[PDB]
Write a protein that binds this ligand. Sequence first.
Ligand SMILES: *[C@@H]1O[C@H](CO)[C@@H](O)[C@H](O)[C@H]1NC(C)=O
Ligand SMILES: *[C@@H]1O[C@H](CO)[C@@H](O)[C@H](O)[C@H]1NC(C)=O
Ligand SMILES: *[C@@H]1O[C@H](CO)[C@@H](O)[C@H](O)[C@H]1NC(C)=O
Lengths: 116, 230, 107, 103
Amino acid sequence: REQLNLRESATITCLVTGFSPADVFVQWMQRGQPLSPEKYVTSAPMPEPQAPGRYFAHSILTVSEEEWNTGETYTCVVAHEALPNRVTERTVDKSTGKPTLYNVSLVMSDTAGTCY
Amino acid sequence: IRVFAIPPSFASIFLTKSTKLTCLVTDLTTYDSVTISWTRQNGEAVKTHTNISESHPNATFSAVGEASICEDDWNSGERFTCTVTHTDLPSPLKQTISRPKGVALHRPDVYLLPPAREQLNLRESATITCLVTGFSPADVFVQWMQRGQPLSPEKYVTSAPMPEPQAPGRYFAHSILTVSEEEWNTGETYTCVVAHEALPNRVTERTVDKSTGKPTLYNVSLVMSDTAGT
Amino acid sequence: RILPEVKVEGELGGSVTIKCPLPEMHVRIYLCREMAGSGTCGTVVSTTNFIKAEYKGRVTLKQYPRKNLFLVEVTQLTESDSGVYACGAGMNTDRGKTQKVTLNVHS
Amino acid sequence: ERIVLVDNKCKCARITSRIIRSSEDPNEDIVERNIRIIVPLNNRENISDPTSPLRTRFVYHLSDLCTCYTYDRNKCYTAVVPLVYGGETKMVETALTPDACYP
Ligand SMILES: *[C@@H]1O[C@H](CO)[C@@H](O)[C@H](O)[C@H]1NC(C)=O
Ligand SMILES: *[C@@H]1O[C@H](CO)[C@@H](O)[C@H](O)[C@H]1NC(C)=O
Ligand SMILES: *[C@@H]1O[C@H](CO)[C@@H](O)[C@H](O)[C@H]1NC(C)=O
């Protein structure tokens, strides 16, 4: 939230943790259109502190603030050998994340016995 | 002298696979060589009966004549005739059984009413009423089950199908079941199961217990966890 | 959840027929006039022979399995027939409505 | 305007979300969580056998929300009813939900 208050650039980070061995891939897609390395970077692959079993890497994307009034959902796609389809696409936008207002509206009826 | 003409109930045609037809004699003298025969509308004879019954303690005889027919013949509306010939009456008496076609088939609606509040105050007995409305034609089969097993007809009484006020030809019927008062307060769920032709599955049921019929307690303990989640 | 509010005009002599969708599985198909004051729905036409007391003898049900339109017709209009007539299915009436529409008097 | 995040029909939860378009201010927006559980209040323990105690608990973990309380309107639930009519016992399939399914 602090970075978004500067209205300059929000950076989305994609963590690929617990993977072994190295050389795991990463790519960013905006609305299903491939994202080049001009606008994104990846941590060269790395190692873990408590367990030596798997190593970690990271990737961060750069954008503007007006872009986070529409989202475009900025999917982070990965490619590693220990994957069924070598793809584990994940995406997060403003709609998901931490919400600031819950209103549960549980109703109780004596005749809504088959939730239509 | 009296001779009956009992049409086969739907509870026979659908369950016993024995859609036969029987005519019973009564109010006659204790005699033999009774010629009770079933015939079709063309005058031809059909299969006969067996195992002639025994007389009644009222010093009146009782016998039954039976004929086995197929279901499609019944659903076509054929006029079968039972004829009784005896020395008592110089003229054989005929009785006609058929199916009057041209009547709509409506599906019964089953309503299970629990006993009234003031009835569960004398602490003597409770009456649960199974009301079937809208069904046409008559002759519907109804029975009761207590914890998944049926009961004898010595504890529940059904009523004859009577016409409906606002309906042209639809009917209604009542079946009351009386049980001990303490047999209804502890639980002991009762079910009313009915079987009329028009039902898409030909059999439906309803159920009541102490916690369902007009309850005085909505004991709710709803819990909701992991509101945020993923 | 369809809301095709149409402006079909009505009068004493005038007749207006509503159109409704049918599941065609011979369930309970009904047209129901919602009451604003009551907050519930009161069936004006049902699959059974029921007809509303105000609408006795002046309404007709017309079912075509061929064309997939379920339509009901009103013979005379007293000009008081202005409300949310919703169609539907299931045993239930209120919570089972499929499409709703409000008819109109004069024009 | 609201994305249908969950439309569960067996426990009847209808969780969803949206972004409320506030004024043209810094992005102090609000994310919505319109969870809408409906309580049957009259169903049984198993949904498909009317012989058990009725229903006390109503547990809703929204992580296993993407045994039931309610009845699916497009599904059919039936049972075997043990009728007799005399000596024979034709255990016949009944209907616990007349109108959601036809023979
Ligand atoms: C939940 O909140 C939103 C806006 O905060 C509101 O539009 C919606 O009606 C609320 N839900 C209920 C059930 O009132
Ligand atoms: C009401 O529900 C609670 C929760 O399980 C239960 O402990 C209690 O026995 C119930 N009360 C009655 C009268 O059954
Ligand atoms: C009661 O619940 C059990 C548990 O799933 C299930 O077999 C069924 O819904 C009910 N039992 C019977 C015998 O119908």
